[PDB]
């Protein structure tokens, strides 16, 4: 009944400013954030196949995990994902994509 | 080893270089 059991994943930083999560029972490390540590925001973002990162000039690109495609402009799908604070569901739930 | 200090760093690396942006074709 581990409903109130502390996670075995802890947070640490490397000399490069990077973060690595350690599992204190299995003794295994990862660069990926385990879904048990993911903050609500991350949980929200984590289901979005489109994610924001910046290029060398600071000009943003948005990448899709399913289709593996890259675009310069923000798709509306991500736009509504950001607005997950006012009108949580933008008239539809993310269970029907027309790509 | 590495029982003192900080625990070990994992194999692999989280995408250091940005995945390819469209260079110009149909975008």
Q: Can you tell me the overall shape of chain B?
A: rod-shaped
Largest Cβ-defined interface: A-B, 18 and 14 residues
Instruction: Output the radius of gyration of chain B.
Output: 18 Å
From the N-terminal CA to the C-terminal CA of chain B, the straight-line distance is 51 Å
What is the succession of H and E elements of chain A?
EEEHEEEH
Strand order of the largest sheet of chain A: 1-2-3
Structural class label of chain B? little secondary structure
- Shape, per Cα inertia axes of chain A: globular
Number of strands of chain A: 6
Estimate the strand proportion of chain A.
Answer: 15-25%
Q: How does the major sheet of chain B shape up?
A: none
Please describe the biggest sheet of chain A, giving its number of strands, its sense, and whether it closes into a barrel. 3 strands, antiparallel
CATH architecture name of the largest domain in chain A = Single Sheet
Q: What amount of the residues of chain B lies in strands?
A: under 5%
**C-alpha Rg of chain A (nearest Å):** 17 Å
Please indicate the count of domains of chain A.
2
Task: Provide the structure class of chain A.
Answer: alpha+beta
Query: Helical content of chain A, roughly?
Result: 10-25%
Domain WW (chain A): 4-36, 44-77
Subcellular location (chain A): Nucleus speckle; Nucleus matrix
Modified residues (Phosphoserine) (chain A): 14
Cross-link (Glycyl lysine isopeptide (Lys-Gly) (interchain with G-Cter in SUMO2)) (chain A): 54
